[PDB]
Design an enzyme around this catalytic site. Structure first.
Site, PDB file in Angstrom:
ATOM      1  N   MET A  24       0.882  -1.195   0.000  1.00  0.00           N
ATOM      2  CA  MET A  24       0.000   0.000   0.000  1.00  0.00           C
ATOM      3  C   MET A  24       0.907   1.228   0.000  1.00  0.00           C
ATOM      4  O   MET A  24       1.783   1.310   0.888  1.00  0.00           O
ATOM      5  CB  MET A  24      -0.979   0.043   1.178  1.00  0.00           C
ATOM      6  CG  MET A  24      -0.611  -0.814   2.357  1.00  0.00           C
ATOM      7  SD  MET A  24      -2.012  -1.003   3.486  1.00  0.00           S
ATOM      8  CE  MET A  24      -2.042   0.595   4.295  1.00  0.00           C
ATOM      9  N   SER A  26       1.378   4.214   1.025  1.00  0.00           N
ATOM     10  CA  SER A  26       1.081   5.163   2.135  1.00  0.00           C
ATOM     11  C   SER A  26       2.135   6.280   2.150  1.00  0.00           C
ATOM     12  O   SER A  26       2.116   7.093   3.101  1.00  0.00           O
ATOM     13  CB  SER A  26       1.015   4.449   3.469  1.00  0.00           C
ATOM     14  OG  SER A  26       0.266   3.247   3.359  1.00  0.00           O
ATOM     15  N   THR A  28       5.484   6.236   2.522  1.00  0.00           N
ATOM     16  CA  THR A  28       6.560   6.078   3.540  1.00  0.00           C
ATOM     17  C   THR A  28       7.761   5.444   2.821  1.00  0.00           C
ATOM     18  O   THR A  28       7.581   5.005   1.660  1.00  0.00           O
ATOM     19  CB  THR A  28       6.033   5.337   4.782  1.00  0.00           C
ATOM     20  OG1 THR A  28       7.085   5.237   5.745  1.00  0.00           O
ATOM     21  CG2 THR A  28       5.490   3.955   4.481  1.00  0.00           C
ATOM     22  N   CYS A  29       8.941   5.443   3.449  1.00  0.00           N
ATOM     23  CA  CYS A  29      10.157   4.750   2.931  1.00  0.00           C
ATOM     24  C   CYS A  29      10.332   3.402   3.655  1.00  0.00           C
ATOM     25  O   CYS A  29      11.458   2.852   3.658  1.00  0.00           O
ATOM     26  CB  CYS A  29      11.398   5.630   3.041  1.00  0.00           C
ATOM     27  SG  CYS A  29      12.680   5.195   1.835  1.00  0.00           S
ATOM     28  N   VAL A  32       4.850  -1.278   3.661  1.00  0.00           N
ATOM     29  CA  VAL A  32       3.571  -1.620   4.346  1.00  0.00           C
ATOM     30  C   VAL A  32       2.780  -2.508   3.383  1.00  0.00           C
ATOM     31  O   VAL A  32       2.597  -2.102   2.217  1.00  0.00           O
ATOM     32  CB  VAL A  32       2.755  -0.392   4.767  1.00  0.00           C
ATOM     33  CG1 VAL A  32       1.537  -0.800   5.569  1.00  0.00           C
ATOM     34  CG2 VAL A  32       3.602   0.606   5.544  1.00  0.00           C
ATOM     35  N   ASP A 141       2.355  17.904  13.296  1.00  0.00           N
ATOM     36  CA  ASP A 141       2.255  17.741  11.816  1.00  0.00           C
ATOM     37  C   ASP A 141       0.824  17.337  11.441  1.00  0.00           C
ATOM     38  O   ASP A 141       0.617  16.312  10.793  1.00  0.00           O
ATOM     39  CB  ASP A 141       3.330  16.782  11.295  1.00  0.00           C
ATOM     40  CG  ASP A 141       3.601  16.837   9.796  1.00  0.00           C
ATOM     41  OD1 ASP A 141       3.358  17.895   9.175  1.00  0.00           O
ATOM     42  OD2 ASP A 141       4.037  15.792   9.251  1.00  0.00           O
TER      43      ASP A 141
END
Ligand SMILES: C#CCNC(=O)c1cc(NC(=O)C=C)cc(-c2n[nH]c3ccccc23)c1
EC number: 2.7.12.2
Length: 281
Positions: A24, A26, A28-29, A32, A141
């Site tokens: 997925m 999402s 990010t590095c 997932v 954030d």
């Protein structure tokens, strides 16, 4: 570790028990995966943190996990079902959400209705207030990419950077020093963006240009001619109080007329959400 707990039931499990349904994105590095638990047919999000992985990434994954593992009593924070630890990996099993408010807005190609943003406001304010009061965490954030929705109508704060620690959403006093009130400002910019389908400083070519508008211009307004309730206009006007010493804290926002309405009002978020997802295949 070594088990999943889903609706109060505890199941022994290891990674072989899960069918990998694919990545997925999402944003990010870290990998997932969407995965199906064979024992029950539950579909879940599984983070795979490699022992050999990037040290910056691993550190922030573990700091976020630390907060999630202690947030089981907040209905407004995405939940961890369990962890598996092998010689080469840590797998973190999370609640699978449908999408983030950022993607929802991209797919909609227009405004998100006030009644959806009301249920969103209750959930996210309660999440950010829970984080601060229970764990001493200032999130720092708040933005549409950190607001998750699913087809069951749940709205939850994302685990991404939930430990705290663009500048499109930055409060005036964080741009130019003179605190949870900076996140209240970010929430106000997020609501105007989602209510209008337009980021309120859109014609900016660089992040510094956005910061100049935050400081030099009037706070953004909800338009007057889209049928927004007086409560919603007032909630956003309070969030976007430029002088932070006059800007309300979460305990004060939680008394606002907008939040009181949406704590009790019946809104079928689930069917709205499935509909939007249908009208946009
Ligand atoms: C296909 C399909 C089904 N679901 C999604 O694609 C989908 C999409 C997104 N998108 C974003 O967060 C982007 C801003 C997030 C999640 C999500 N579920 N559970 C989580 C726990 C922590 C962090 C993120 C998540 C699931």
């Amino acid at each position: 570790t070594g088990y999943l707990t889903i609706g109060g039931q505890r199941y022994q499990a290891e990674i072989n028990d899960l069918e990998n349904l694919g990545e997925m994105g999402s944003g990010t590095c870290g990998q997932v995966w969407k995965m199906r638990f064979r024992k029950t047919g539950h579909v879940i999000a599984v983070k795979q943190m490699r022992r050999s992985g990037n040290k910056e990434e691993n550190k922030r994954i573990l700091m976020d996990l630390d907060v999630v593992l202690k947030s089981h009593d907040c209905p407004y924070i995405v939940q961890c079902f369990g962890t598996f630890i092998t010689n080469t990996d840590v797998f973190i099993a999370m609640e699978l959400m449908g999408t983030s408010a950022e993607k929802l807005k991209k797919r909609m190609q227009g405004p998100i209705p006030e009644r959806i943003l009301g249920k969103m406001t209750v959930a996210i304010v309660k999440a950010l207030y829970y984080l601060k009061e229970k764990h001493g965490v200032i999130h720092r954030d708040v933005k549409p990419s950190n607001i998750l929705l699913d087809e069951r109508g749940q709205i939850k704060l994302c685990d991404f950077g939930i430990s705290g620690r663009c500048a499109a959403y930055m409060a005036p006093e964080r741009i130019d020093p003179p605190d949870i009130r900076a996140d209240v400002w970010s929430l106000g910019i997020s609501l105007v963006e989602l209510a209008t389908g337009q980021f309120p400083y859109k014609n900016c070519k660089t992040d510094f240009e956005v910061l100049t508008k935050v400081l030099q211009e009037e706070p953004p307004l909800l338009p007057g001619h889209m049928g927004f309730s007086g409560d919603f206009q007032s909630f956003v006007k309070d969030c976007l109080t430029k002088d932070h010493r006059k800007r309300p804290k979460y305990n004060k926002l939680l008394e606002h007329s907008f939040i009181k309405r949406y704590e009790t009002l019946e809104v079928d978020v689930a069917s709205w959400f499935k509909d939007v997802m249908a009208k946009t295949e």
